[PDB]
Amino acid sequence: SKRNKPGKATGKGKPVGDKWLDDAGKDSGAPIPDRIADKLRDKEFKNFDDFRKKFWEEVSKDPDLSKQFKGSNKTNIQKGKAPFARKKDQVGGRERFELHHDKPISQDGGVYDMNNIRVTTPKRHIDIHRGK
Amino acid sequence: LKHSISDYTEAEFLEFVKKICRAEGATEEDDNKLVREFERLTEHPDGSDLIYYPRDDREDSPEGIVKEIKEWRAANGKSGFKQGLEHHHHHH
Ligand SMILES: [Ca+2]
Ligand SMILES: [Zn+2]
């Protein structure tokens, strides 16, 4: 429900190198890269799904992130679809990387706060929320 | 065809892999449904990784995916594709 209201992206991402989504299956997941956050900051989004689609589009425009995906995943992100996670990191019915709110939305974590958003594998998003 | 990968000719199975690779589903779930069916049909242990995380030493393309599946099924004594009409001769 709070994910269904519009908002504006704020905040700072983090430095990211050549193994960005290696982080996505551990701890709180991988950060929004700081140069991506720079490009989205203070833009208006109609809902979180809007932000999610525009986020993956922005990733597609960043050659140093784009190069971390093989061809079919590059096609997905250019179309604003999330990339597929590795088979070992998927859950039945949940095959793609997921955006997670480190401080959860239910705990008044900011929905479009880019310091708060993480990219996680489906297994790890579930395991974060059951305390693993 | 629909029950088994052996009900598809190789051309028809390639058109299916092409479709997944285009990622043009109107929603992600439409394409996810194709991927789950791909895993069911191929029976290949790597599943979706064949599509999205391919081995570096064959081609990253729908044709490369179809070749790696063909070879693995042959190697493992599984039934292969339906015979197509490619071998048929037209008179002149
Ligand atoms: Ca998501
Ligand atoms: Zn979460």
Domain range holding B11?
1-92
The Cα A99–Cα A28 span in angstroms is: 11
Domain containing residue A110: CATH number: 3.90.540.10
Which secondary-structure segment (H or E) carries B12?
Answer: helix B10-22
- Return d(Cα A41, Cα A26) in angstroms, integer: 26
Annotated binding-site residue? A128: no
Say how far apart CA A3 and CA B83 lie, in whole Å: 51
3-state secondary structure of B9: strand
CA of A96 to the centre of ligand 2 (A): 14
Q: For helices B10-22 and A71-78, what crossing angle results, to 10°?
A: 50
Q: Which residues of A touch B54 (CB under 8 A)?
A: 70
- Classify residue B72 as exposed, middle or buried by CB count within 10 Å of its CB (0-12, 13-18, 19+): middle
CA gap B51, B32 in Å, rounded = 12
Q: Which residue of B has its CA nearest to A74?
A: B52
How far apart, in Å, are the Cα atoms of A71 and each of A30, A53, B23?
21, 19, 11
B contacts of A90 (beta carbons < 8 Å): 48
Look at chain B and report how many structural domains it folds into: 1
Distances (CA, A) of B84 to A37, A58, B7, B76: 51, 43, 11, 22
Name residues 85-124 of chain A within 8 A of B (Cβ). Answer: 86-87, 90, 95-96
Distance CA(B11)–CA(B19), nearest Å, equals 12
**Beta-ladder partners of A117:** A101
DSSP at B65 = H
What's this structure's resolution in Å? 1.7
Closest to B39 in 3D by CA, of B55, B54, B24, B51? B51
**3-class DSSP state of B43:** coil
How many domains does chain A divide into?
Answer: 1
Please list every residue in chain A whose beta carbon sits closer than 8 Å to the beta carbon of residue B24.
79
Tokens of A62: 């960043």
Question: Catalytic site residues of A?
Answer: 3, 94, 98, 100-101, 125, 129
CB within 8 Å of B42: residues ≥ 6 apart? B5, B50, B69, B73
Measure CB to CB from residue A81 to each of B28, B51, B61 and give the nearest one.
B28
Residue A67 labeled ligand binder = no
Cβ B41 vs Cβ B50: under 8 Å: no
Q: Which of B50, B54, B14, A86 is nearest to B5 (CA)?
A: B14
The whole-angstrom distance between B23's CA and the closest CA on chain A is: 6
Contacts of B11 (CB under 8 A, 6+ apart): B84, B86
Structure tokens at A71: 């061809």
CA dist., res. A128 & res. A122, Å (int): 10
**CATH number (domain holding residue B6):** 1.10.1200.20
Strand partners, A30: A119
* Range(s) of the domain holding residue A99: 1-132
Question: Locate tokens 């594998």: which residue?
Answer: A121
Question: Distance between CA B44 and CA B54 in Å, rounded?
Answer: 13
Q: How far is CA A57 from CA A8, B34, B92, in A?
A: 17, 22, 53
| Other Cβ atoms within 10 Å of B55 Cβ, number | 12
Sheet of A98-101, strands arranged across:
A30-31, A117-120, A98-101
What number of residues does chain B have? 92
CA B77: distance to chain centroid?
17
Solving technique: X-ray
The three state secondary structure string of chain A is CHHHCCEECECCCECCCCCHHHHHHCCCCEECEHHHHHHHCCCEECCHHHHHHHHHHHHHCCHHHHCCCCHHHHHHHHCCCCCECCHHHCECCECECEEEECCCHHHCCCCCECCCEEEECHHHHHHHHCCC
